């Protein structure tokens, strides 16, 4: 399996490790596939690059 996550810049390396750990766990449970058979990429951008509910997001603020 291949997973991608587009999200705003600003997450720490530790947050990214928690995200990957979690996504790998849930994909592995669903598909039966081991970590060796999963690839994951995070793609980062500024807040203005994301539009939800018709509105552009602000830059990310921790907390």
């Amino acid at each position: 399996p291949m997973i991608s996550c587009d999200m705003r810049y600003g997450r720490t390396d530790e947050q990214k490790r928690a995200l990957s750990a979690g996504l790998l766990r849930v994909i592995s449970e669903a598909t039966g596939e081991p970590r060796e058979n999963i690839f994951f990429v995070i793609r980062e951008g500024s807040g203005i690059n994301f539009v939800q509910h018709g509105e552009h997001l602000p830059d990310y603020v921790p907390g």
């Binding site: 995200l19 996504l23 849930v26 060796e36 058979n37 939800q52 907390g63």
Partner: protein, 58 residues
């Protein structure tokens, strides 16, 4: 966030639906994102169309 998951075809609707629920929950728990800004797309592929770490299926 926008999470796109490319998996082999053949999983169940409940399994795919649970997978979507699981990805929303784990994104919420790991990076603290409110579900209102979490978006998920599940895409199913024939095994022969996917290669991880240079492996050729079969």
């Amino acid at each position: 966030p926008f999470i796109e998951c490319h998996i082999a075809t053949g999983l169940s609707v409940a399994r795919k639906q649970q997978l979507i629920r699981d990805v929303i929950d784990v994104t919420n728990k790991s990076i603290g994102s409110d579900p209102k800004i979490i978006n998920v797309l599940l895409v199913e592929h024939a095994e022969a169309n996917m290669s991880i770490s240079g492996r050729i299926h079969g």
